Amino acid sequence: NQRSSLRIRLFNFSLKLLTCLLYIVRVLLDNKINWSHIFWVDRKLPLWAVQVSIALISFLETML
């Protein structure tokens, strides 16, 4: 299809916009070679939950 194929790519496109733009906000709030600050990083819980839901949709889009 031409119409329906354009919508699923728009959904997968605009989903991946949100995850990148949500990553900007959590960086703005969080604040020897320290690997403490590199990996163990207190990401926000409400902004984490939206990133997981987008990940589950895009994981299922690859499965389909």
């Binding site: 960086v27 070679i33 590199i38």
Partner: protein, 80 residues
């Protein structure tokens, strides 16, 4: 897209040594791909240098291939 990836990784690594902001990192990243080389803001960490080298290496792969593909089309009507 490559500009955003550099600003993420460098700033995230820079939390260990000299806390740069997104504003200060975006200045540094777009400078490195434009090839000015200010070096006023710099990576002062073992993995931060390791990334910034890879950012420049990945930039050397991308930039010349995109400019050549643009001029390929540029070489070769009435509107509504």
């Amino acid at each position: 897209c490559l500009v955003f990836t550099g600003t993420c990784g460098i700033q995230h690594l820079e939390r260990a040594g000299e806390k740069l902001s997104l504003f200060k990192s975006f200045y540094f990243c777009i400078v490195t791909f434009s090839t000015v080389g200010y070096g006023d803001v710099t990576p002062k960490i073992w993995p931060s240098q390791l990334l910034v080298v890879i950012m420049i290496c990945v930039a050397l792969v991308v930039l010349p291939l995109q400019f050549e593909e643009l001029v390929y089309l540029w070489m070769e009507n009435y509107s509504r």
